[PDB]
């Protein structure tokens, strides 16, 4: 069929983050105005943060309900309220990349799971449950699970949960660029300092001759001077 190509083009226009940045160059003008914008329906349900109403916090034990990790149990490490997504320990191991540090050639790590695909676990029955916040007379808050009526254990602490995020380090290094030459990366502090002194003279010398063994005198820079 002779329409698949144009259909794919117009559909990619729906995902394009137009306008994209464009570097000016002499006698060249951007095509961004000619690129059309994506079309969307603006009358939709308002944003919500489902974690607030579900009483789900980092450090809670949850079970993945659907997908290739069905039945797997892990501790929540991160919650995105805007995306209503959750990172679960050892689940959705989808993001693999060249190792930015020491160890094996490749490293893989979790990816967010939508909060609706996950459920809190009852401490006694260990099945999907619903957690409600109750308040005592003094104002102490207690999270109670529907299935057994048990109080939720305190979330695992950030100190225990912490792990480095190697994908962000990989992204940082990639943004920096390809690896440097070993010779270029070798430090040369003495010659660098010589060049830095020369650069100081070049930038702030106002075109005075460089010092020599014959005349090492110090040339006084001129001030801007007021108009009179």
């Amino acid at each position: 069929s002779r329409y698949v190509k144009v259909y794919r083009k117009v559909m990619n226009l729906q995902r394009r983050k137009t306008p994209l940045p464009w570097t000016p160059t002499f006698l060249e003008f951007s095509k961004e105005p000619s690129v059309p914008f994506p079309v969307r329906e603006k009358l939709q349900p308002a944003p919500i943060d489902l974690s607030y109403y579900l009483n789900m916090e980092v450090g809670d034990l949850v079970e993945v309900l659907h997908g290739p990790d069905c039945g797997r149990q892990g501790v929540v490490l991160s919650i995105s309220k805007k995306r209503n997504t959750v990172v679960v320990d050892g689940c959705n191991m989808k993001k693999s990349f060249w190792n930015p540090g020491v160890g094996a050639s490749l490293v893989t790590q979790e990816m967010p799971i939508h909060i609706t695909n996950v459920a809190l676990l009852d401490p006694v029955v260990k099945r999907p449950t619903r957690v409600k916040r109750r308040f005592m007379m003094n104002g102490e808050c207690v999270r109670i699970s529907k299935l057994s009526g048990s109080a939720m254990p305190e979330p695992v602490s950030t100190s225990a949960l912490r792990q480095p995020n190697l994908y962000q380090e990989y992204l940082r290094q990639k943004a920096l660029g390809p690896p440097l030459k070993a010779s270029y990366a070798r430090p040369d502090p003495l010659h660098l300092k010589i060049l830095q002194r020369l650069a100081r003279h070049i930038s702030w010398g106002q075109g005075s001759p460089l010092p020599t063994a014959e005349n090492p005198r110090v040339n006084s820079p001129e001030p801007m001077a007021l108009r009179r």
Partner: protein, 141 residues
């Protein structure tokens, strides 16, 4: 040209000691004031030989309409105000200022016209260099 190249495996760049030695040779031949050499030194120092790296930053040309405000006092010496123009308005260029804008040409003017673009660029570079100045404060006199 090369100091601006990336320091990756596929580029040819001078090393720091090579730049120092080249500067020394030009100094011995009384060419240390070379514009290209000076600019190469500056660009090399700016990046420390290309070892300190940052994402490509673009200095803004326009700002958003209702941007935030950064409040800072005038960091200027005392008793200083911008200079004031002479009179109110200059005479009309076409109606009264025609004679002042035209002058008979001379061989010196022809020579200045015939001067080359490299000489013009060096003149501009050295002029900016010499005129890079600033206003002093009381404790600097």
């Amino acid at each position: 040209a090369a100091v601006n190249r990336p320091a990756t495996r596929s580029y040819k760049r001078p090393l720091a000691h090579q730049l120092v030695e080249l500067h020394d040779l030009m100094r011995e031949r009384n060419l240390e004031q070379n514009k290209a050499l000076e600019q190469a030194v500056l660009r090399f120092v700016a990046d420390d030989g290309g070892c300190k790296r940052r994402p490509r930053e673009v200095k803004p040309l326009l700002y958003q309409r209702n941007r935030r405000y950064i409040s800072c006092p005038d960091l200027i010496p005392d008793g200083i105000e911008p200079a004031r123009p002479c009179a109110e308005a200059l005479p009309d260029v076409f109606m009264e200022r025609q004679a002042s804008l035209v002058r008979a040409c001379t061989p010196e003017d022809l020579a200045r016209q015939e001067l080359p673009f490299a000489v013009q660029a060096e003149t501009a570079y050295r002029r900016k260099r010499e005129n890079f100045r600033r206003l002093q404060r009381n404790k600097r006199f």
